[PDB]
Amino acid sequence: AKTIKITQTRSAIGRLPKHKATLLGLGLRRIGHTVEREDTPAIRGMINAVSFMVKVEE
Amino acid sequence: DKKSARIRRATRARRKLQELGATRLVVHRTPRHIYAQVIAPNGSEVLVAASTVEKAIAEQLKYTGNKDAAAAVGKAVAERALEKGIKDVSFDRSGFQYHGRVQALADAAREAGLQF
Amino acid sequence: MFTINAEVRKEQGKGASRRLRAANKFPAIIYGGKEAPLAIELDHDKVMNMQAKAEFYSEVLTIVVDGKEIKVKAQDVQRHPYKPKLQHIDFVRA
Amino acid sequence: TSEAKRLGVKRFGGESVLAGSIIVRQRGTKFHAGANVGCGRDHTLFAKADGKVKFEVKGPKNRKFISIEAE
RNA sequence: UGCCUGGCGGCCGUAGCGCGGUGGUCCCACCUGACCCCAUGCCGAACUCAGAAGUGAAACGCCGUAGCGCCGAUGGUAGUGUGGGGUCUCCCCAUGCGAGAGUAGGGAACUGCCAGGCA
RNA sequence: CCUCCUAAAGAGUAACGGAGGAGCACGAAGGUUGGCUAAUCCUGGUCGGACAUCAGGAGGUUAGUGCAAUGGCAUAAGCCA
RNA sequence: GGUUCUCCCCGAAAGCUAUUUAGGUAGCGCCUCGUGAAUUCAUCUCCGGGGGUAGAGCACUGUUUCGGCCGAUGCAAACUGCGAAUACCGGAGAAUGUUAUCACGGGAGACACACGGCGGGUGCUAACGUCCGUCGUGAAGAGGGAAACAACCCAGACCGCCAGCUAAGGUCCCAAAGUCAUGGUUAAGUGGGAAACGAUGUGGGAAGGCGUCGGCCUGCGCGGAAGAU
Predict the structure, then answer these.
(1) Number of C-alpha atoms within 13 angstroms, CB side, residue C79?
(2) Is the CB of D41 under 7 A from strand F?
(3) Which domains, from first to last, does chain D contain?
């Protein structure tokens, strides 16, 4: 399906291990890193998990 | 309370036989008529049913309910089971007493050569 | 008889309800019958003004949205514990 | 003017438990054995054959039965 | 293939509680005596022996009664994970999940097999 | 060594924390078959009125199951032979 | 107490179960190297579970009050006819992750942790008082901000550049950047010290009164409000 750009906005230093694992699953390493990911319900839930520091180009 | 007590008392063996999942032979005894049914482990289908009301076996019987009628029902069920292949069903007394017509029917059924 | 102006709901959820309350609005529901229920949006000021009359509890309400006449009756209303404001109403089509 | 004991369900629904596994070690009988499930002297439900574990509500009293189906 | 009756399962208050009516064609029920198979922690109390000799008394099958009870939306409400803010004892903001109760509505249940009477 | 909470609906998770009891007993209170299975309350009894007993009912597990306490328990895990 | 040359990779803990124990003894957990092995493990989506916590409710165990124990109304740690989110177990699935998973072996280190956020117990529901479950920082993290100031906010330093963008925080001078704009509030240097009470101070707002005289609410000021060269 149509793909989307996911970019990391804020750092993940003080975030929870769950949020760190979510960022690892998304594939974001550094602040401002952008990745291309296909849009699926699982990816949408993963984004919503850490929505406070990820920007999505819908 | 007679029917309710009878059903409650029979429910003991009725549930006990279900754990091992074997075909069961149940008998419903009434002064007017007698019935004997073979029920599969599922509990919704009967392999063979015999009744005293039907004229197939009541022609030679003076009355539908008596020791002779019970013996005839037992022998008919036994022969039908032999020709169907029940493979040694278990037995249930339906909460009755194994001293009168129930015992006569059981003896008649076992006479054919059953191993229950 | 009385003319009521309302708006058609588009969003459903607690977020939408909070938006309506904060924007001088409040949602409402009309049901009754074999047809599906309809969610509507009504401004708070007009309903507050109309609630003053004693005939409100004795008159069948007429709703006109998108040029469609709906004849309903007040089945239930929701009132804040201490704030004199209206937040929701369930109505039955008569 | 002590030491806590271990309770609760050990194996939940969908687990392909083995024969003799203790599905639940409870105080009394919170759930009743159904098909292919035993009942120990201490009222412990243990599996009798390999398969999946299911909980089903049946009976006039609406009592939950623990049962094992084919794996 | 339709009505009625019993037995065997699923479902376990949409199967229940209260009220009026209907069932002896078949089936089911009330019962005589038991000195006879059997028995009372006394009682033939319960089971067993011979039915229409009479009946549907009571139980049970069915129709209506929405009176009680049950389930049950949409919506809202309280609550809550995550990030932030405030006057930080407490509350709010964006997002996700979402109460109980009640309202609309339903229902006086349904379904699988065997047996028997009437068609 | 056991009986519920604080202990934030898996288990676990604090301060001579809040709480008592067993440190026994039944060698029958063990196993098996048949049958039975209330408590409680209204009413009749010489007194009995409910309270020293029985039978006509409402009601279906509130009685019980050896224990201090606890869950689950009428196909009673009870209660007669 | 001391323990002497350099570079590279990974990189902890101050916790849980026993003690005639409290400074110590065993196992697990945490670190590293080697070997072997399953889409092994992690995030997320859907599905099957036991919940009995929040919420609600008095039907279950109980409490106060009301009409004269009967009925009703509110309420709860050893209250639930109902019942979340969250957490836990298992099954299926796209994507990412240097296998991050598991087992064995060699080597350890550590065994007075501190502070802060979140929800409780305790405490006189007075304390920057006390203990818990979870997470973060320091310990072992350099850099920027709060004047300095481990516990706060942003952010994890391989090296070099007199290159650009930005997070927190700021743009009158010290000192880099708005003496920028728009609509307001304050007269107290309030800002730049603090809650209860009291008050002819002000803008604004919904409701009164038979041209009329007054009441209610929000915002910002005043004594209490007091730190020692």
Answers:
(1) 7
(2) no
(3) 15-70 (2.40.50.100)
